[PDB]
Amino acid sequence: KPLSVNDELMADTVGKYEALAWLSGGLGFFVGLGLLAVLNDKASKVPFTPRVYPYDNLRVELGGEP
Amino acid sequence: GRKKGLPEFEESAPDGFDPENPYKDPVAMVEMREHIVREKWIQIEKAKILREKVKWCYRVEGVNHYQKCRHLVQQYLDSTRGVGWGKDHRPIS
Amino acid sequence: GGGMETNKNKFIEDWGSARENLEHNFRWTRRNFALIGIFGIALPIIVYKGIVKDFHMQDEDAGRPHRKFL
Amino acid sequence: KKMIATQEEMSAAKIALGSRDMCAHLLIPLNKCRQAEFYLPWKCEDERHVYEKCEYELVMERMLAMKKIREEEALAKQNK
Amino acid sequence: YLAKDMMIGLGTNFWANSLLVLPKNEILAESEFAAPTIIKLIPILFSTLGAFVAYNVNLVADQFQRAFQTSTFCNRLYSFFNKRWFFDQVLNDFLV
Amino acid sequence: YFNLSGLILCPVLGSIILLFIPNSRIRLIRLIGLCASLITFLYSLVLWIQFDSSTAKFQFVESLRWLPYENINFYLGIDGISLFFVILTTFLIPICILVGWSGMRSYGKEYIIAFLICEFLMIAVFCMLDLLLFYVFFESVLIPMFIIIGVWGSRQRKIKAAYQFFLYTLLGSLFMLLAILLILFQTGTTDLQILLTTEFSERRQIFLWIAFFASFAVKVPMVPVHIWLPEAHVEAPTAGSVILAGILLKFGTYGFLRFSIPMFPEATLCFTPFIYTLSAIAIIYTSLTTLRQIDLKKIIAYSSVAHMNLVTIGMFSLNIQGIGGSILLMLSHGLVSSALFLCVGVLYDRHKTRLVRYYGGLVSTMPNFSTIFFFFTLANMSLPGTSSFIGEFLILVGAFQRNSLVATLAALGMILGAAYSLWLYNRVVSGNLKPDFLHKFSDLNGREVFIFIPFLVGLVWMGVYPKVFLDCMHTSVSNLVQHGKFH
Amino acid sequence: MYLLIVFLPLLGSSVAGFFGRFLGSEGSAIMTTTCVSFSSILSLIAFYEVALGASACYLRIAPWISSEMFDASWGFLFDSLTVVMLIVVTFISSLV
Amino acid sequence: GITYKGVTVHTPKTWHTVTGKGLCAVMWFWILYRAKQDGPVVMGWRHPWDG
Amino acid sequence: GDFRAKVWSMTGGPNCRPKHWRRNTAIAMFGVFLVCIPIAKLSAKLEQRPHMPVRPIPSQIWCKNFGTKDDYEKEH
Amino acid sequence: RWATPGHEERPKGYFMNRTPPAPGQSRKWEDWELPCYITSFLTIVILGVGLNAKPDLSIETWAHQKALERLEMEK
Numbered sequence A: 001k002p003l004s005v006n007d008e009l010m011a012d013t014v015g016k017y018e019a020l021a022w023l024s025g026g027l028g029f030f031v032g033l034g035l036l037a038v039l040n041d042k043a044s045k046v047p048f049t050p051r052v053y054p055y056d057n058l059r060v061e062l063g064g065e066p
Numbered sequence B: 001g002r003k004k005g006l007p008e009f010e011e012s013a014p015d016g017f018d019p020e021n022p023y024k025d026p027v028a029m030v031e032m033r034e035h036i037v038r039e040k041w042i043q044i045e046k047a048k049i050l051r052e053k054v055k056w057c058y059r060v061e062g063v064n065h066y067q068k069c070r071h072l073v074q075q076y077l078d079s080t081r082g083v084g085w086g087k088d089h090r091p092i093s
Numbered sequence C: 001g002g003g004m005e006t007n008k009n010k011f012i013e014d015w016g017s018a019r020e021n022l023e024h025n026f027r028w029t030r031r032n033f034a035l036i037g038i039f040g041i042a043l044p045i046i047v048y049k050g051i052v053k054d055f056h057m058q059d060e061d062a063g064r065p066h067r068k069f070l
Numbered sequence D: 001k002k003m004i005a006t007q008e009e010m011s012a013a014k015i016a017l018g019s020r021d022m023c024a025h026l027l028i029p030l031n032k033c034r035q036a037e038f039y040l041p042w043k044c045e046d047e048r049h050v051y052e053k054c055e056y057e058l059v060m061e062r063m064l065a066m067k068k069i070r071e072e073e074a075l076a077k078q079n080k
Numbered sequence E: 001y002l003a004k005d006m007m008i009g010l011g012t013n014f015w016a017n018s019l020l021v022l023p024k025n026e027i028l029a030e031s032e033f034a035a036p037t038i039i040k041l042i043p044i045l046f047s048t049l050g051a052f053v054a055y056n057v058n059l060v061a062d063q064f065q066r067a068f069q070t071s072t073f074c075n076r077l078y079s080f081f082n083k084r085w086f087f088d089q090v091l092n093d094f095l096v
Numbered sequence F: 001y002f003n004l005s006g007l008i009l010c011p012v013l014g015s016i017i018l019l020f021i022p023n024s025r026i027r028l029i030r031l032i033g034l035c036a037s038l039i040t041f042l043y044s045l046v047l048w049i050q051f052d053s054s055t056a057k058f059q060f061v062e063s064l065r066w067l068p069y070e071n072i073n074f075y076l077g078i079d080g081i082s083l084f085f086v087i088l089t090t091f092l093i094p095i096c097i098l099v100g101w102s103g104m105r106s107y108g109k110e111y112i113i114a115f116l117i118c119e120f121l122m123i124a125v126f127c128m129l130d131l132l133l134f135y136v137f138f139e140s141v142l143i144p145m146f147i148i149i150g151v152w153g154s155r156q157r158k159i160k161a162a163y164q165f166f167l168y169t170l171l172g173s174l175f176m177l178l179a180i181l182l183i184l185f186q187t188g189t190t191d192l193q194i195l196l197t198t199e200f201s202e203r204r205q206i207f208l209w210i211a212f213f214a215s216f217a218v219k220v221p222m223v224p225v226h227i228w229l230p231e232a233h234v235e236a237p238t239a240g241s242v243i244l245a246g247i248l249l250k251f252g253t254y255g256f257l258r259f260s261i262p263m264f265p266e267a268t269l270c271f272t273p274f275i276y277t278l279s280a281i282a283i284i285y286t287s288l289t290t291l292r293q294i295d296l297k298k299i300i301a302y303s304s305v306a307h308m309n310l311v312t313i314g315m316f317s318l319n320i321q322g323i324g325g326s327i328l329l330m331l332s333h334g335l336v337s338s339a340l341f342l343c344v345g346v347l348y349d350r351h352k353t354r355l356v357r358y359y360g361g362l363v364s365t366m367p368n369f370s371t372i373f374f375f376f377t378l379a380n381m382s383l384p385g386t387s388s389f390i391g392e393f394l395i396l397v398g399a400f401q402r403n404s405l406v407a408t409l410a411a412l413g414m415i416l417g418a419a420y421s422l423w424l425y426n427r428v429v430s431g432n433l434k435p436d437f438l439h440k441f442s443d444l445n446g447r448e449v450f451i452f453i454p455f456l457v458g459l460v461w462m463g464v465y466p467k468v469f470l471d472c473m474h475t476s477v478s479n480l481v482q483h484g485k486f487h
Numbered sequence G: 001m002y003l004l005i006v007f008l009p010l011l012g013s014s015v016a017g018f019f020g021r022f023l024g025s026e027g028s029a030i031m032t033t034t035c036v037s038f039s040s041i042l043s044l045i046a047f048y049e050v051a052l053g054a055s056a057c058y059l060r061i062a063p064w065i066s067s068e069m070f071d072a073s074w075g076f077l078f079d080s081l082t083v084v085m086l087i088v089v090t091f092i093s094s095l096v
Numbered sequence H: 001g002i003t004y005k006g007v008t009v010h011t012p013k014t015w016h017t018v019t020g021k022g023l024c025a026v027m028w029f030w031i032l033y034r035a036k037q038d039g040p041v042v043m044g045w046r047h048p049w050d051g
Numbered sequence I: 001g002d003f004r005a006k007v008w009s010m011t012g013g014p015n016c017r018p019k020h021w022r023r024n025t026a027i028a029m030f031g032v033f034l035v036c037i038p039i040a041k042l043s044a045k046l047e048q049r050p051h052m053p054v055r056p057i058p059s060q061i062w063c064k065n066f067g068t069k070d071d072y073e074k075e076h
Numbered sequence J: 001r002w003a004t005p006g007h008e009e010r011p012k013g014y015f016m017n018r019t020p021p022a023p024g025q026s027r028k029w030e031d032w033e034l035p036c037y038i039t040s041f042l043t044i045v046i047l048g049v050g051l052n053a054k055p056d057l058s059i060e061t062w063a064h065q066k067a068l069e070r071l072e073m074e075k
Ligand SMILES: CCCCCCCCCCCCCCCCCC(=O)O[C@@H](COC(=O)CCCCCCCCCCCCCCC)COP(=O)(O)OCC[N+](C)(C)C
Pocket: F363, F364, F365, F366, F367, F368, F370, F371, F374, F375, F378, F383, F384, F385, F386, G013, G014, G016, G017, G018, I004, I007, I009, I010, I011, I012, I013, I014
């Protein structure tokens, strides 16, 4: 029983390509949900104006020019 | 038998060296190389001292470090442009 | 059995000898030619082009003209 | 509502940036008493409630303005 | 409960300079009173729904697992979630 | 007053004394050889103490006339670059002597004599400041190493490996010698300090640089010529491999640092992408080929090519982080790699085999060896707190500043380096025992425990406080970074 | 007192792994448990002192890597964020 | 230890049962006590003092 | 087994239980205590507190670098 | 478990796999131990007493006290 030449590296119900297709579908679920989130456009539906800080949006306290 | 204390180096450009034809007087060339290395190390240590100043300004001030350490941060970043053998920004010494 | 030396096996020893005597095992087939002409002739060229172009783009960002790397 | 907390007193209390908003004057005593009570969640209630009410007032005052601006946007488009 | 006030309170100085949040992207105040009370109760409703589903599938059920023995898609769907979304199998074969 | 003359004469006296001693007195030969090696090591350590670290001038300079008109002469001197190489090459010899302590009765006096002549020849290589004599001692190492490989080889393959190594070294050597001759004829002399102040015409820089690269790249195997190293390394005694990997692989990089990076500053810049390309693929290819090797000594021998090709990325970066951090890697590699071959030598001396298949479960029978083997496995895979990480990280920060892409490719070296380094340890040490193959064991003896001690101490001392070594080099490596530059 | 927080587990490991043959299966457990527990109580004082007392401590032992400007010394930084992780990590480690 | 059909079940010691019951009772009492204090707040029926 | 009783390991081996582990355990504590003293003394010397504490903290008993770096403009 | 004396009177296996010498005798040293131990002692003595006593000559010290001097002369 001579040993194999590649005798140094040695989910049975699925194949590599079929399981890759399943993984691609699973990740396409995330991609489609992201596209739906883009389509929702939640940015234009914000219920409050952007917060405005005093002293010119705290320019001096944030490192701005004195 | 070297004298006790820190090393002493003459801080002056070696006379006889001309940038027009550097490969003219070999001794002035090596002296100039050593001298230039010495001032580049001086610049490096000055940048390190400024870095220490910024380091202890960030910790002592705290939240107010944006307005109190602005003066030091810009000095340190101005002094780190011409450090030496670093990024492609090389000083014209 | 008063010896520390291994009881070497014929199968393992022959397999190791075959794996170490692979120098004389080419047939110069299309697989070897394509393999050595791609992963030994093209990947180095691709990498060299990568570093050369990285240097070129570093040079152009600072405004200095390109350096003659030849 | 006009600012009461000036710049030098906010820096002395070391109020975190972003919390130096319109209601910062009420935040200084609240932060003083939080430290003196080890940040316990049941000791400083009178100070906390005033600051929370001020913050709620700011949030309501901004949402009302945003509602007005959206009403103005919706009025112009459909009345073209 | 003890650390709720010091860490996620409004304007707390517990963190001091450890954490920096820029004034522009600060939405902690609106997180409390800017949203309908339904949003603050979604996790509880979903937790109750999940608990009810788990009880109805485990403690008392007809055990319709015969679907897993007659539906080819159900068996493959069961294998997909069980085998870590087919990461170990696919990643091994295609990279390692 | 300790100078370079006594350090070089000590191995001479050691080899002469054993030359005229009867072979029946086996004890006296071993004692005198070990004493000579230890005295040389202490001499080097003393030379470290009195080393000035504020001047770029060569220190402890000594001169001896060679040609009648003083055109070429024996100029010996050390600087911040070659001091640690001298210390390492004097420290490795006593370990090599101690390796063959038990079986020395069969080798005889010709073993210690060969190793002492080796030490004599390698000390002068790192100390020569003359281009021609650096070549003379550069290629004088072949004879002792040829004898070591052939006379005391393992199997009959020793004839082939010695021939192959000798042929490669010769073909590099003469193509370098032609360039050395052309430099001598044009300039007039071969003194390094004079050759560093002579302007070379731009056309002659490329040819001379290529000719120098031909000889150096063989001894720092880049890509086309790393086929002699595995065979000659495996067909070598346990102490023979320590010399080949510990020091003989450091000639190419030292030759680049001393005679290439300075004498041609313009040529070095033009060929920088070429060296980056060869080193990047060598790191990727060799660290990947290592996974599919089955010989214990052929896996570690492939761990040196990846590490030594990571050094040539550091040297050609031409900054303090790069050049300065590349020196620490070679000192670290000279200790980590040479310690790994001691671990393999321990396994081979007891069980006369090297295939990884026969080894397994040694954690339950040789625990001290497993603890020591694991520690050097961590060092080989660039763990922080070890001397390898300091050199490995300093090279990366020295190359990222010059080219982000080459620092990215070289960063995958530690990805693959950590793969086979631990995977080998799992096979050899961890697992179940195989009583069918091998059943008698013996853990490390007194010699093996004591031999590994300086490696253990010298690996963390450089790994947690490398400031001792670094501060002795910055004055010397900074003058190396800029030579043609004047701004 | 702050170096003890970091180095007590190291000393316990260095004792229980180098001289475990003299302590056995009980002494080796006692050494590590006692060292980690003392580190945990020291982390409790560190929390009372830095997080609640609002006085961070900065401790530098020696320079580790000193290139031209690649300075990464052996420095320890205890601020509000660090102390929370201390009282979590060390307490969980002592309980484990 | 009670045997029904060969198999026996060792009765747990008093310390374990008492501790488990006490901890569970403490959890329930704490949940109800918290629901008494700020239960209306999370329901949105009443702000603490905001309005 | 029978051969693992003939193997010397630093950790002690399988099911190690020396006859005098009580005495050895007491010595190990005392050794750890003796090496922890210089570490504590070293820590109290190299530690820096730029900010005065809100309330008297125990570290003021031994540490002396409280409010020292307030003049950061003259740092090295 | 925590009170019963142990059974292993002495640690299993000899240290460095060397049998203890004859009673009332001593481990006879090998021919290499004494030179190696005196070498290892002299190495520690030279490095600890030499590196810590050599003057702090460096380019990160002279340059430091030159930069610290020119940094204040600019004011
Ligand atoms: C270098 C920087 C990072 C340092 C990380 C250190 C992490 C530990 C590294 C070594 C761990 C040992 C792994 C290799 C040996 C595998 C296990 C072994 O055989 O070791 C022996 C020896 O025991 C040890 O593991 C000692 C090594 C670890 C203890 C020393 C560590 C000291 C602290 C770590 C270093 C301090 C500084 C770290 C920070 C830089 C234990 O044998 P037993 O448990 O009794 O079972 C074996 C069966 N039979 C007895 C039959 C043989």
